[model samples]
Structures are given as C-alpha cells and as structure tokens.
Target: PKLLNRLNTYVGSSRVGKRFKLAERNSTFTTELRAGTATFLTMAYILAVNASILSDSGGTCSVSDCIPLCSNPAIEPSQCTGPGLRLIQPDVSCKFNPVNPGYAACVEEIRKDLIVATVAASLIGCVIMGLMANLPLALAPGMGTNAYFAYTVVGFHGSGSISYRTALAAVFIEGLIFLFISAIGFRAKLAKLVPKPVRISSSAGIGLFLAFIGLQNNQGIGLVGYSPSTLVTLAACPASSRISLAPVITSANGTVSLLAGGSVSGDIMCIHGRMESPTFWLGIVGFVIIAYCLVKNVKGAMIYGIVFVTAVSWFRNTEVTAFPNTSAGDAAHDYFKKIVDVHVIKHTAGALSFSGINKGHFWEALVTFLYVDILDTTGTLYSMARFAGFVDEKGDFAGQYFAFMSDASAIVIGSLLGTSPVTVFIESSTGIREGGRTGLTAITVAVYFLLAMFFTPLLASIPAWAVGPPLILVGVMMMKSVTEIDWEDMREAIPAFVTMILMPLTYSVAYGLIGGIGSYVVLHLWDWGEEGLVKLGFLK
Candidate 1:
C-alpha cells in the first residue's frame, strides 16, 4: 500500500502529469491509461497494412536468379549457367541481387523494413504529439498517401519510373516545406482559405479510394486481368449474367431461410459454374461480420473484424503466400517464423537515399506530394479537433499550431526511417470517443507501437482480405462528411462532386485535388468576375 501510494505521488507530481493537466482536466490516472490503450487498439492495424502495401512498390524480380546464390556460396554469377540468368524486365528491378535468395526474399526484406519504419515513426510521432503538442492525436503513415507513394510515385504494375529512394526524398522535401509553412503561421491561413466543401470532398474522395483498394485487392472479389475492359469487372463473374434473387436454404425442405419473410436476396449465377475459391467466400463472410459489428457500434470494431476473419482463414488453411515462390511450404514456414521472432528489425545507416531524384519530373512529384499532404492534414486536424472539443470560442484550436508542426516533423522522421508521409490519422477519433482527452492517450498509443515492433510476424500473417473490410468500413464512415457540403450551391456542389468522384476514378488523390481546385477556380471566376473574386478575398 505504501509503495503504491509513493508511486502514485511520483507520477502525479511529475512534469508530464502537470503539463498535460491530469488533475485540472478532471482525468484520473486509470482513465488516462485506459484511454491511451483504447486508442492504440483501434489504430494498431497500420503496422501490418502499411508494410503489405509498400513492399510491392518495386516490381518483383526472378526467384530463380536468387536460388543458385542461396544454394552455393562459391558459385560465381558469371560461372553459373542457368536458363534466363540475365533476362530481367525493365519494369522489375531488385535492390539486392537475385542470386542471394530470390524475389520472395527481397520482398520479405522490404516488408520487414516497412514494418520497422512504421513502428518507429509512429512511436516517435505519437510521443512528440503527447509531450510537445499536449494533444491526444496519434500519427502514422497515412493510408491514401502511402497508396500514392506506392502506385503513383513508385509504379506498382512495373518498375517505378522513380526509384524508392527518390520518392523518400520527395517526402522529405514536402516535410521541410510543411515545417516552414507552420513556422511562418501560413498553415493556418492556408487552412482557412480552403473551402469547407473542398476539404470534406477531399476526405470523401480518399474514402472511396480506400474502399476501391479493398475491393480491388481482396482475393475473392478482385478482378484477374489488366486489360482495360476486364480490369474493372468482378473476378470470374460475367457481365452478361442476369442478376436474380434466391433464398439461402439450410435444409432440403427449405426449413430455414436466411432472409426475412422467406424473401430472396439478389444473386449472380456465374456463367462458368459457381465461384470456387474458399478465400473469396471467407472474405465475404468477413465483410458481413465487420459490417454488422460496426452497425452495432462495437468497440474496436475494425481490429476485431480483422482478427475474426483472420482466425477463419487460419482454420481453413488459406494459402498464405503473397508472392510466387519456388517452395510454397518453405515460404509459408519462413513467413510464420519471422513474425514470431523478436529481432526482425534490421539496422542500417538509415533508409533515406537521394539517388534517382535528379530526374526531370522531381519538382512535379514533390508538388503533388506537398499539396495532397497539406490538404489532408488540414482537413483531418479541423475535423478531429472539433470532435475532441479542443476548439476555442473564436473557432480555433489551442493546440493547432503544435499539431501541424508535429505532423510535419513526423513526415521528416518517417522519410528518414524509409516510409511515406506520416500524418494525423482520423482513427484517433475512436480513442476520443472512448474518453481520450489528453496527451496521455497519444503516449499510450506510442507504447503500443513500441510493443508491436516485436510482433511483426503475427501482424504480417493476417491476409489482405481480413484487413480490407475494416478499411472499407472506415471509408464508409468518412463519407458522412460528404453530406455536410451545401449541395444547393452549384459553386460548392460542382467542386465537391469532382473532388469526391475523381480521387477513386483516377486512382490518385493529387489528381482529384487538382480537378476540384481547377473546377472551383474556373466556376467561381465565371460566376463572380475578377472584382467579385477580390471582394471574396480569394485575390487581393
């Protein structure tokens, strides 16, 4: 009892406790701890998901090239005679020579680096947010930004036109620009200059993009071909097939029906028999379960949905190999083994490299990154701050300056650690909803990130299908902001509509933002004229 009392006294009287106003905020130690933990549980999925997305940024190399290198140490590459030894695709490149272990090994290494970077960057960013900003927000590599980093910057289908290191340099430069803007107080001013409709539409657009990624990547639901016509269609499902309603029957006599009033739900009969993949059916089940849980307002709904679906996959013995491998069994075994081991972190000077950035389009890529990041960060901060009741009487958040600064700092830190731009995650709202009102919430999130470093293997084991549903759900949740736009005003409606639709269709947030801004400017000028624009404070 005496020891407990002494520990309490020490913690309560500490600088952190006082600075965060644990007492003045009417927060108990236990409440703060619980809030922190709740916040972490909701956002922890990023460690695995980000790694999975970014590891494929560079296209795959031949596995055969790596096999000989692994089998014989003394065998020189020139001395060895193997079929297609020097045959390499222009779109596919390897950071490490394939002679060592092959494409799978290279992918594994990249995944490991991504996981480590995610954990390290999140830990640093969240801790900074907690101590320096004294805010409850948690930071991590953002979803849409990472997608842009992988597919747009580092081409996903083929060898990236720009190397991964150069992409990191772009992120680094964007961070420096953000830092400068925040220092000069231009960030807040810029935030005010953006219309509410554009801001909401930007988030809504990213939401659609997230859902598109989920649907397009899931094993069961995804399309198989890259041809323009087949790219958007459902896998193994025909376009000509007429949709019909059918009742789900449990017994031969139709004793049990799944739907109400024995009514049938819609169904698509496959032209080439029924779809046979267990992984696909499992994904559907997972999506339904997650949707139900979210509707019920379950706590930790996203993570719970992922775990539930993953357990089903494990029980069904779903194929775990993401990349093609010479030995599937060995690849699966190695994958599981690495996840369980605590020392997956590989140390190097740092992941940041400036090579290949001198190419002609560097400035263009840098500007795209900067524009998307600034708008995304601005919108997220405004929405989250309003939710957490941090806004003052004058409609400004007290911690706004520090929050923006912390986000910029995180991006620099993330680029140095070798990942995409780190930003304030909207998922932090889950914690705020659970009574997270202070920096202790962010501190707790940081501790969880630290613990996750050792659990990378287990995190990696989760299939994309399981993770896909939650992202889809989060996208659905984010779409609520779309309703906030004044649809009656043509000026606002046109830009918002363009922003919301273009993001997913073009598969690029920057492009969607461009479309929105361009339309908004053209329409506003057409309606109001130059003098009207000056009166509107857009141009003075």
Candidate 2:
C-alpha cells in the first residue's frame, strides 16, 4: 500500500505533472484523461469510416487477383469490373453486390486489415504528437484526402488513372516531401506568407466546417443532406424514409453502379420522416444535454453527451439502437457481440507499389496532394492551436516544427497502412474546448486507440447521432473567434467573410483558404498598382 501510494503520487501532480507542466499550464491528470476520452469519441467515427471509404479502392484486388470462374476466351473474370458474364466467385465467402466474389472477399479483407491500420496509424501520430510535441491533439486519416484518393484518384476498384497500390506510393512521396519542407522551418514561413485577413478568418471557417460536418449524416447528427437545387437541405430522417435519386449506370463490364447524388453512405434525400428518426432524436437529446451542461458550468459536457447517447444506443432492443434489425445492422451486431478480438493486418500492411513513381501522371497526383495538403492541414492545426490559446503574437503555435513533422509523418505511415493522407483532424477542438491543455490529453487518446485494437467491436459501435451533439457544440465554441476579424474594414471584411463562408459551402478547407488568399491578391492589387505607378513616376 505504501508503494502504491508512492507510485500514485509520482504519476499524480508531483512527477507526471512536472513533465508536462500540468500545474503551470492550469491542467490536471484527471482533466486530461477525461478530455482524452472526449477527444477519442469525437473522432471515433473514423474507426469504420476510413476503412469503409478506402476499401472502395479495392486494395490489392485486381483483374488478376484470383482465378477466373470462366475459361472461355470470351468470358472475363474479376469482381470489381469486367464484360461478358464477368467471372463469379465459386466460393460462398465471396460477397459482392455487382462485384466478383473473389474481388468482394479481397475488399472485405481490406476492410478488416484497414481497421487495424487505421487505428494503428492514428496511434503513431497521436502518441508521437503527445511525446514529441507535448500538445493535446490527435491526428489520423483525414476526411477530404481519403475521399479524393478513393473516389476520384484511385476510383472504385482502381477505376481511376492510378491504381490503389500506386496511390499509396503517391501519398508516401508527398509525405516525405512535406517532412523535409517542415524539417527546415519553411512550412511555418510559408504559413506567414498568407494574407493576414485570410489567416485570421480561417479559424471561423474551420469552425463552420466542423459544425457542418456535425449537422450532416454519415459522421454527424444528420440535420443536413445533399440537394439538387439548393446544394444542401434538411435531411434528418430515418433510413427507410429516404429515397434514392442516384443516377444508375451500367459499367463497361456487366456491373451496374448506383452513384447517389448525396455524398457518403446513402443518406440521400429525405422526402419525409423528418424529426421522426429515433437516432436523430437521440442525437438532438445529446446536443441539448451538452449545451445544458456547458451552460451550467459543468465539465465533461461533451463526454456526457457522447457517453450517455452511446450508452442508450448500446442496448440493441431500443429504438435508437446502434445495431438495427436490417441486414447491415445484423452483420454489424454480430461483430459488436464479439466485444473483443485479436485482429491482424493481412493485406494492406505493406501492399504499396512504387511503379507509379515513374509516370508523369503520378507526379501530377503527388503535386495535387501536396498542394491540397499544404493549406488543408495548416488551416486545421492553426485553428486548433488558436482555440487552445497556444498561438503566439507571431501567429504561430508552440512546437510548430514538431507538430508539422508529426503531421507529415502520419501521412507517410498512413500510406504504408494503405490509406489516404493522414493529417491533423479539426475535431481536436472538442477537447481543446473541454480544457485539454497538455500532451497527456493526447497520450490518453492514444491509449484509447491502443485499447481499441482489441475492443474494436465495442469501441467501434458508437452511432452517428451519438456523435452529433458534441460536434455541434464544438462548432459554436470555435465560431467565437470570428469576432477577431476586423469586420468594420471592407478590405479585411470581404476576404474574411469569403474565407469563413466558403469552408462549409464548398466543403473544402483548401478551397476556402484559396478563395480568401486568391481574392486578397487580386482585391488588393489597387494598392500594389499605386505603389508601382509612384515608383514609375506616373502617380502623385
């Protein structure tokens, strides 16, 4: 008991506190631990989402992945795509909607393998961010870049210009390049090059961006969905109430594809059933709880919201159960029941192929990734740091160099894990708001990721509605920075307004920053021209 007390004292504010300077920073061990739990749940949706999205790349699956079902020269085999009675898998284990069963199995294997890689990738970035940077932030497979790699760059089953294997190679090159750039201090210098107004407005821009994600389905509470005329509309509805307005296309092979106009997992247009969804209501209740708790000056408001909603939804018999009665629900429930499992990375661990580096097109993709990443990540991290009050008068944060290295390094590891460019996710704002002030918050999150490897079934079962409330509040908290913009001055106002509005509207942080920065260059050309004319002796 004396030894236990001594160890506890060491880990308490005495030793551990001195390491991260918890007392100096106005933080404690328990606060960071709770904040870490909150942070983990906020980004927990990534556990399934990254794998599900990237699996569309089809991993190692290809036309020659397995033996064909047909021997006739006229018959083509492969599950992803083909023409003339595409070879179907003879095995019952091969599952595909329109895919070859062999291809189907490959994709399925990719999903499971990715679950580990995704979590593992997150742990490396998060754990390192904790130790090296001593900050309360977590990094993982980001949202936009993964969609770009899977849906556009690699396409479904490598239908795009580059194959999945090659795209992984593309990410690695881009990551390595960024690492060197950040290593030499050029990354922060480049950040200072942006127009001051645009830089200032990005905080609000990302806040709106985060809130929009919270409002939408897939990751958020499902208050918004894709629209044909308006671009977005009220879409909070039960799954059955939604109607598909997707364009049906018969692939070059005999496979038929349905591309929903709505982005993400078939949230589609909700013709009716608005406000009737049990999950939606659960999400709303969670939101109110967090708002109320926050108003009452309570701590762990986000955690209470996420935890309570998750606990309620955990019971399968309930209306808002995470596991539903549908086939997909049943399938997920079966896995959830496992509670714990020893999983392994079978395919995607070292599945990268470097052959694409020789092509001009590959470099083209790599350049795009680098460009997209430059602003995408810098904007998110800068906003997160500001929210945590970590930025200095120079508009830079402490540990900027290590943070940049940690971020780029995550992408390098993510490519090896066979996924998209991992970056500093903006969701870190949830805990930053929850009073997470030290690296221990990040370490706690990594600890969750480490445990999540075994408890994937239980840890991964959280529903989107359970996710909704906490996200909405973070958006509100982040938006308070908008007041810092000089709204009275049009020069600052126009660019700043454009920057803030563009993020949620365009759904791209890179685009918002581009619009603000680009607009600044052009809109301020009057001043530049005046200086040039004065130098040329043309103006007074």
Candidate 3:
C-alpha cells in the first residue's frame, strides 16, 4: 500500500501527471492503462504490416518474404545479402541455404529500418498528442496512406514509379505545409466549411474502405476486373448466385478443390474451392465471432474475438499439415520465434533522399500527398472526437489545434526517420471506446509501442486473418455515423450518398471527399441562386 501510494504521488507530480489532469478528468490510472492496452492490441498489427508493405523498394525479395525475414534470426543477416535464396518460408518454415540465401540482407536491413522507424514515429507522435493536445488519440503511419506510399509512390509493383526517397520528400513537404496551415488556424476553418452530412458520410465511406481492405487482405474477397463498361467487379461468387453444397474434392496429391455447382458467371474468376480452405474458414469464423461479440455488447470484443479465432486456428492446424516438408511443431515454433529476439536497428542517415523532388512531377505528387493526408487526418479526428465525446457545444473538438499541429510535426519527423506519413489512426477509436478520456491513454499507448521494439517478431507472427477481423468490426462500428445524416433533405442526402459511395468505389478517401464536397457546393449554389430570384421578384 505504501509503494502504491508513492507511485501515485510520483505520477501526480510528474510533468505528464500535471499535463493530463487525471484527477480533473475523472480518470484513474487503472482506467487509462486498460484503455491504452486495448488500443495497442487493436492497432499493433501495423508494426509488421507496415514494414511488409513499405519494404518493397525495387528490392530483390517481394514484400511477403521481407515480412517474416525482418525478425527471423534463423537466417543470418549475412546470408540475406544476395537474391534467389528463400531463407524463411511464408508459412514460417526454416529453409536455409548456406550457399546463397535467396534475398539480400540489405532488404532485411531495410525492413528492420522500416520497423524501427514505425515504432519510433508512433512513440514520438503519441507523446506529442498526449502532451500537447491532451487527447486520447495516438498517431502512427496510416494504413491506406502507407498503401499509397508502397504501391503508388514507390512503384513497388507499378512500373515507372518514383523512388522511395522522392516519396519521403513529398511527405516532408506536405508536413511543412500542414504545419503552416495549423499555425494560421486554416485547418480549423476548413473543418467548419465541410458540412456535417458530408463529414459523417466521409466517415462511413472510410469504414467501408477499411472493410474492403480487410476482406481483400484476408482472402475473403477479391477484385475481378476493370473495364470501361464496368469500373470494377467482385472476383468471388456474386451475391446474386446460389451454390449447391457438396463435398470438396481432395486429390491424391493432397490439394483440396471445391466444386461449385451454381449459376456463376463465366467471366468471374472465383477461387473455386476457397470455401473449404482452412484460411478462408478461419476468416469467416473469426468475422462471425467478432460480430456476435459486438452484438452482445462485450467489452474488448474485437481483441477477444481475435484471441478465440487464433486459438481455434492453432488447434485446427494440428489435424492437417499445410506445409509438407516442415513438421507442425517446427512450423509453430518458427511462427512463435519469428516475433521475438528481432534486433535490427540502424542509423537514419541517407534514409531520406530529395533528388526526385526536383523533377517536374514534384508539384503533382506533393499536392496528392498533401490533399490525402489532410482529408484523412481531418475526417478521422472529427469522427474520433465525436466518438469519444470530446466535442464541445460548438461542435469543435477540444485541443484540436494542438492535435493537428502534433500530427503535422509527426509527419515531418516520420519522413526524416524513414517511413510514410504519420497521422492519427481511426483505430484510436478502440481506445476511446474503452473509456480513455485524457492524454494518459495516448501515453500508455506510446509506452506499449516503445516496448514493442523488443518484441517485433511476436507481433509480426500474428496472421493477417487474425488482424482482419478487428478491422472489419471497427469498420462496422464507424458506419453508425450514417444514422446521424439527414436523409429527408435531398440537398444533404445526395452529397452524403456521393461521399459514402465514392470512398470504397474509388478506393481513395480524398477522391470521395472531393466528389461529395464538390457536389454539395454546387447544390448549395443552385439553392442560393433560386433564393436570389425570389427576393428580386424576377420570377413568381
């Protein structure tokens, strides 16, 4: 009891203690700690996921290989310097080649660098958010933004993509612009300019976008086509089709194939037997379990759902071996071992290159990065503030100025440290939902990220399927904002509908915002013109 009281006293007197106002906020230390833990558990998947996505920098190995190798000490760092050696199997099998490890250790080194940068950026951003803004929000390199960085900016898979260093320069410039805007309070004014309907719809749109990503990543869904006639179509069995249930066929070679007896379109490239695949089933079960938990109003439902599904997946694997050459025990050991003992930190020098920025495409790239970051960050903050009950009577979030400034600063810091743009994550809603009312929640999140530096391997070992469920569930929760929109008024409804649909349809949040806001302004102008005619008695 004496020790406990001393700790409390110290916490109260410390700088963080006084800044967060734990007593005035009516929050206890335990509450803040729980909120932080929940937030970290929900978003920790980003540690490995971001590294995997960003590691594709014209490197020899694909993103898939770099993800596991980033922390797998089984393959020595020296062995990773060349191409063509598959050091670690995607399924966590230890397949070593002493002669020439297929991929470059330099690739592994880059992955390590990205992982460390992610953690460092998260820590710095969280601390800034907590201290300066006194909000429960935590910042990290954003999900979709990172995807844009990897696939679009760096041209990982895309031909004629700009260099990673060029992307970094764009991010740095974007941050500086954001800082200037925040300093002059332009961001706050811009937020007010966006109508409530458009804003709420934007949140719902992002929710669908998140769900789409989760489904796509987990192999639960796929994109089939892109054409002038049809912009995009689903790859899986269409919702309109009915399936005839039958036993799946397993060949002598041990490959399971499903026989779909349905009115399926010949054009659709469906994964014929994915229904019987263990990974597919696991994802479905995980989604259902999480949905049920949320429906039952269970606390920490998303985390609990992930835990339940991961355990079930483990036991299910015991009956059938997915990897033929590797024993189940060996695979499990490798899986667990991949997420531990990963210590590959490097200096940040030469990480950010600005040579590409001087080219003609600089303005175009900078504008795109700045526009997306601003819209994404602004939409996320407003929705999170509302979700956390942090908005005041004026419909503005408290400490929003500080929050925006911190986010801008983090983006600059992140670019310098070697990663994508740092921004507030919608996943912070997980913490806010758990009763996080002050900066203490963010501080707690920062501490967890700091600790994660040591356990990169364990965190990376969690399958995409496990992380997918939480994202889908959170996406569902975020869609509740749709209910707040006034559907009776076409002026608002049309814009809201445009915003909500274009987000997932275009797969870009900024595009959705543009579609919605542009239509809304046009509609309002039409209304104003009509009003002027009546006032002047030009028409009756």
Candidate 4:
C-alpha cells in the first residue's frame, strides 16, 4: 500500500501525468489504462468491419478484363481452365455468389491492405487525440461514412458516382475543409447552437442506434434481420440455409433471374432455420458472461467476455468455430493461424485520384462528406462528452478546440491512409463509463491500436458475436441517462422523442439531429410570432 501510494504520487507529478491532468480529472494511470482497454475492445470491431465495407469498392482494381464470361482477351494465361469458364472463385463478390477470380483476388488483396491502413490510421489518430486533444475519445475511419464511401460514392465494384480513387480525393478535400471550420471554431458553435433536449436525446438515440447495429449480423450477433412479408425478422441460421430476398427479374416467356443489385440486403433474409445457429448460441453465452461480470462488479467486464468468446470460438470443429469447413472459412483460418501478421499497404496506399474533378459527383461527394462529417462527428463527440461529464454548461469540453482540430487532422491523415472520414467513436462510451477521464485513456487506446497493426491476424479474428454483446451492454449505459431529460414539457418531449427514435430507424446521426432540430424550430414558431407581434404593438 505504501509503495503503491508513492508510485501514484511519483507518476502523477511526472510530465506525462501533468500533461493529461490526471489528478485534476480524478483519474489515475491504472483507471485510464482500464478505460482504454474497454474502449479499444469495443471499437476494434472496426478492424474487421471497415475493410470489409471499403473493399467492395474494388480499390486499385481496374479494367484488367480477367473474367469468366469475357475470358482469354485479358486473362492471365495461367487462370484459363476451359473454353469459356475461367477459374472463378465462389462466394467472393457478394456473399454466396461468384465473381472473377483475378478481380476477386484484387479485392481480397485490397481488403488486407485496408486492415493495415485501418490499424495505422486508428493508432496515429488515437495518439494525436491523446497527446494533443487530451480527451478520452477514440478515433477511427468511421462506419456510415465508410459505407457511403464504398457503396454510394465509389459504388460496389467501382460502379458508383465516382471511382474509388476519386472518392478519396473528395475525402481529402473534406478533411481540409473541416480543419478550417473546426480550427476557426465554427464547428463548436454549430454544435452549441443545437436545442438542449435535441442534443440530449441525440446521445440517447445513439444508444439505440449502436444497439440496433449490434443486434445485426455483420457488426453484432445474429439477433435481427430482413423478413419476407414485412420488415425485419429472426435471422440466426446456417449460411447455406439463408435465401436471398433480392427482387427477381423475369423474361417475358422464360425463366427468372434474381436482380441481386448492390442496394439489396440479399444475404440476410432467411427462408427457414431460425434460432438454429451455433454462433448465435455462442454469442448468448458471451452475453451471459458479460452480464455476470457486471453483476459481480468486475472492472474490465466487457473485455473478459470478449476474450473468452474469442478464444473458445477459435476451435476448428466446434459448434462455434471461427474457422468452418468452407472456402472463405478455410482462407480465414489460414490467416488467423498465423497468430502474428505485419503487412505493408500495397494496393490501397496513396491511391487518391483528382481526374474526376470536372464531374458533378466529385464536388457533390466533397460537400456531402463535409456535411456528414461535421454533424455526425459533432453529435457523436457531444454524446461521448456528455456521457463522460466533460461537457460544460456552455456545451464545450475543456479542450474543445483541440478536440475538433484533432478529429479534423485525423481525417486528413486517414485519407492519406486510404480510408474514409475519421471521427470520435460512440464506442468511447465504454471507457468513459469504465472510469476513463484523462488523455491517458486515449494514449492507452493508441498503444493497443499500434499492437493491432503487428497482430492483425489475431485482432481480425475476434468474432462479431463477441463484439456485439458489449455494444448492446454499452447501450444500457447510454439509455440509462434518458431520465435526465424533462418529460413534462411537450415541446422538449416531442423533439427529444423524435431525435431518439430517428437515430436507430434512420441509421444516421446527422439525420436524427436534423429531424429533431427542425421540429424544435417549427414547434417554437407560435411563441416567436407572439413575441414579435407584442414587440411591434400589434398585440397585448
């Protein structure tokens, strides 16, 4: 006890502790370390997810013409197996389907490159966030922005409004624009100008939003998914038993073909076999472990559950095996077995293109990125700040200026790293609730991210089921704070309800804020009009 006291005093007065205001914020090095660990495990889902989304754009995959249908003209001489059918890998393009092996290979290579890029961008961004901004916020290439970058702006298979390179060019320009806006304080003012209830509810709504995604298949456990007759339904089953719900296109006199367009949620809807998944039951066990830890007051409850699930899922032939007896499963096992992988970015590094500058989509993509970046990050940061007790009466944190600047700079850096916009993550809610307070938490997050770069195989292999439980648990913390908002006032209540409801349903932070803020202003028009008439002596 005496030695530990002296150690705390010794480190607390040191330059690093003083820099982060450890004692001032009522935090110790150990708590910050725990906090960082909690935050990283939650956000590390992005390591597997971001690359999966972005690689659909086919980064650096050009018109090589190596395909099954149009074979031999530009096919690699070694790949041709027959007259018309070149070697095509199954389940590479879309899940449960086939595309050109060479193209698929390029996309696969790009996915690996993105894993390294994701690690590098997150590590540097987290370091900058800690060392400069002094906040307990974790930064990474974000979710919605990355989805937009891959599917909408760049398109699946590079078939969208702009090329993959051009999308990055837009991302590049948007980051600089943010640096200008945030550095000059416009960003903070815009955030501050939001109505109080709307702001509060945005955080509450983000809880539902996070939980909603956590309940899905890719990001979370297999709890919710598409239905045949209605909207969402039960989805957990074996991969092959699932059926595509994509609309079919039929010729006038003959057979039908499924129009499995890029927009379709083709892989999720189930024909049968609900609640029969091995991984789903495994996820339930992980959730039970986390819940038990919480009940017992364990400090690193979520981390223990994640590690437990991850280790058990590593078995080859178990009910919850990470490596199943299939091709993609086989490939994942090959990589995951490596245990340690340090890869250099090849296909996706510095691949930004300015050639599409003349196109309207180029400018549109830039502005949309800027608009979404501002609102999404602003709402998310405010939610995290409010959660951590960092927000002041004036709605600014201690290092608000530097926080915004750090976020903007990370986006610029992430663009160079060949990614979408970087932002403060809602997953930081984990660490904040775990007793995180100082920049030490951010620094600890940075260290783990750095380690993840070298240990990509291990980090990438952590199952979505394990990650989902913590995210849903994180939602419990967020939703618990909703009692702080006033329910008696109708004006406040409606906007708050709208903000909270819209976040999960719309799957957008900016849209939820806009919906709530717009309703608030419209609702107040009667009060504003009455005051104006009284001031002009037109009414009593």
Provide the clash count, candidate 3: 12
Better of 2 and 4 by lDDT: 4
Please, what are the lDDT tens digits per residue for candidate 4 over residues 165-253? 88888888889989998877677576566688886776678778777867878667886878767788888886667765556888889
Residue 264, model 3: lDDT of 20
Each candidate: RMSD: 11.0, 7.4, 9.8, 5.5
Question: Which 10 residues in a row give candidate 4 its minimum summed lDDT?
Answer: 88-97
User: Candidate 1 clashing pairs?
Assistant: 66-98, 91-159, 339-457
Query: Candidate 3 residues 1-540, lDDT tens each?
Result: 688667767787777676678767666577789899988877765776677667654322333443335234556654665555454434311211111233334554566667777899999999988988989988888876775566555653322357666677788888999999988978757657667788678768877877776665222223333233564444334322323233367888889877653222223334343344455456667778878877886555666766666555444234222222344335444655564665655644246667776676666667767766777787788899898777899988768888888999999999888888888887788788878889888999999999878765444334545666665666787789888888998998999999899977776666687789899889899778989999999977
lDDT of each: 0.70, 0.75, 0.68, 0.78
Best model per TM-score: 1
lDDT over C-alpha atoms for residue 372 of model 4? 61
Question: Looking at model 4, how many pairs of residues clash?
Answer: 0
TM-scores of all candidate predictions against the true structure: 0.79, 0.69, 0.69, 0.74
Q: Against the true structure, candidate 3 has what lDDT?
A: 0.68
lDDT winner? 4
Q: What is the C-alpha lDDT profile of model 1 across 276-371, one tens digit per residue? A: 444556667777877787788766666776787776655323353332244543565476666455644463116555776677666667887787
Candidate 4 segments exceeding 4 Å error? 1-66, 69-96, 99-104, 133-167, 246-265, 354-400, 423-445, 484-490, 506-514
